[PDB]
Design an enzyme around this catalytic site. Structure first.
Site, PDB file in Angstrom:
ATOM      1  N   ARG A   1     -33.867 -62.413  50.351  1.00 27.22           N
ATOM      2  CA  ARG A   1     -33.149 -61.572  51.316  1.00 27.22           C
ATOM      3  C   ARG A   1     -33.191 -60.095  50.920  1.00 27.22           C
ATOM      4  NH1 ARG A   1     -27.810 -65.540  51.724  1.00 27.22           N
ATOM      5  NH2 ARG A   1     -29.059 -67.466  51.964  1.00 27.22           N
ATOM      6  N   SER A   2     -33.008 -59.804  49.620  1.00 27.27           N
ATOM      7  CA  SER A   2     -33.038 -58.415  49.142  1.00 27.27           C
ATOM      8  C   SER A   2     -34.382 -57.763  49.445  1.00 27.27           C
ATOM      9  CB  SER A   2     -32.775 -58.363  47.632  1.00 27.27           C
ATOM     10  OG  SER A   2     -31.427 -58.733  47.277  1.00 27.27           O
TER      11      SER A   2
ATOM     12  N   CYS B   1     -28.876 -60.334  46.328  1.00 26.86           N
ATOM     13  CA  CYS B   1     -28.532 -61.625  46.915  1.00 26.86           C
ATOM     14  C   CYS B   1     -28.231 -62.550  45.735  1.00 26.86           C
ATOM     15  CB  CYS B   1     -29.636 -62.107  47.859  1.00 26.86           C
ATOM     16  SG  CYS B   1     -31.396 -61.974  47.221  1.00 26.86           S
TER      17      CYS B   1
ATOM     18  N   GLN C   1     -39.583 -64.648  49.507  1.00 31.73           N
ATOM     19  CA  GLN C   1     -39.679 -65.934  48.798  1.00 31.73           C
ATOM     20  C   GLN C   1     -40.336 -67.049  49.598  1.00 31.73           C
ATOM     21  OE1 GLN C   1     -35.302 -66.005  47.660  1.00 31.73           O
ATOM     22  NE2 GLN C   1     -36.114 -66.955  45.800  1.00 31.73           N
TER      23      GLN C   1
ATOM     24  N   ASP D   1     -27.265 -70.780  55.549  1.00 25.22           N
ATOM     25  CA  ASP D   1     -27.495 -71.452  54.263  1.00 25.22           C
ATOM     26  C   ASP D   1     -28.958 -71.862  54.096  1.00 25.22           C
ATOM     27  OD1 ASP D   1     -24.796 -71.292  53.314  1.00 25.22           O
ATOM     28  OD2 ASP D   1     -24.579 -73.459  53.147  1.00 25.22           O
TER      29      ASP D   1
END
Ligand SMILES: Nc1cc(-c2ccc(Cl)cc2)n[nH]1
Length: 282
Positions: free
Chosen positions: A221-222, A215, A262, A181
């Protein structure tokens, strides 16, 4: 510089935030006018994440062709990817229309439906074989065929039917279920194993349309997934693998979608994944 020793040099000097801010400063800025039209407000999950006009995927529909999705075309590596946000309640039909129209074989999902107690994307595939889904706005039917649950990821076989023509196709759903998370994984080993399973399925190969990867926003994440895949492919193709510059590859991918990677932690994790992956390939 090479990668593994540039890596140790940034760790010892603790300058990951400065490296990452340089990338942010140099990244491309292109217009995203279609994304910002008022009629498309409920088609965007986040107001600050939009596809560029020049690389956006167009739905084959004359009313409204907009979806928050981008084509990332990597010329030297000879790989393409579609990066998109997690589908919204009012865009699940658009999502599967895109999969159909772009001739994709695979969908790669890097988030859980609920994270941090909030919904990160819609439940856009069926959870039981006998309870199929019908998307009336785009005239598609979707059926769960089989499901294989493993410790770090789940693979599903799905049947997509175009109800207008009665044509059917098999779609593979690759769901990475264990990204924490907060932060990034401590080791890249399970993420690399997952990448290799997607590769082994044919979903990334030129005989199919581009893989669809998402994502929640489709940039973090992508971005890590396609950056690691492309860097490893270039290291196999070139005479000198140490010439592959992960920062330069990331800036090339950011010509096609804003904001890929990010955080500075995601950048460090991408380096780690490519470094460890290059040892296993040989
Ligand atoms: N008996 C059977 C059917 C299938 C099947 C059907 C449809 C898709 Cl899309 C994929 C697999 N495998 N085995």
């Amino acid at each position: 510089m090479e990668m593994e020793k540039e890596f140790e040099q940034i760790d010892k000097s603790g300058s990951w935030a400065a490296i990452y801010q340089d990338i942010r400063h140099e990244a491309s800025d292109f217009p995203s006018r279609v994304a910002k039209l008022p009629k498309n407000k409920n088609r965007n999950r986040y107001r600050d994440v939009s596809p560029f006009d020049h690389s956006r995927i167009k739905l084959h529909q004359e009313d409204n062709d907009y979806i928050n999705a981008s084509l990332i075309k990597m010329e030297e590596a000879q790989r393409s990817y579609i990066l998109t946000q997690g589908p919204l309640p009012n865009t699940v039909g658009h999502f599967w229309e895109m999969v159909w129209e772009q001739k994709s074989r695979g969908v790669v999902m890097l988030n859980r439906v609920m994270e941090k107690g909030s919904l990160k994307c819609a439940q856009y595939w069926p959870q039981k074989e006998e309870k199929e889904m019908i998307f009336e706005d785009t005239n598609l039917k979707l059926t769960l065929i089989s499901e294989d649950i493993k410790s770090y990821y789940t693979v599903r076989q799905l049947e997509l039917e175009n109800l207008t023509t009665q044509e059917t196709r098999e779609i593979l759903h690759f769901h990475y279920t264990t990204w924490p998370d907060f932060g990034v994984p401590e080791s890249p080993a399970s993420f690399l194993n997952f990448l290799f399973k997607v590769r082994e399925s044919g979903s990334l190969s030129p005989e199919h349309g581009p893989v669809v990867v998402h994502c929640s926003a489709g940039i973090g994440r992508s971005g890590t997934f396609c950056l690691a895949d492309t860097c490893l492919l270039l290291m196999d193709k070139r005479k000198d693998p140490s010439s592959v510059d992960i920062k330069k590859v990331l800036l090339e991918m950011r010509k096609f979608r804003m904001g890929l990677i990010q955080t500075a932690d995601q950048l460090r994790f991408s380096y780690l994944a490519v470094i460890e992956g290059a040892k296993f390939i040989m």
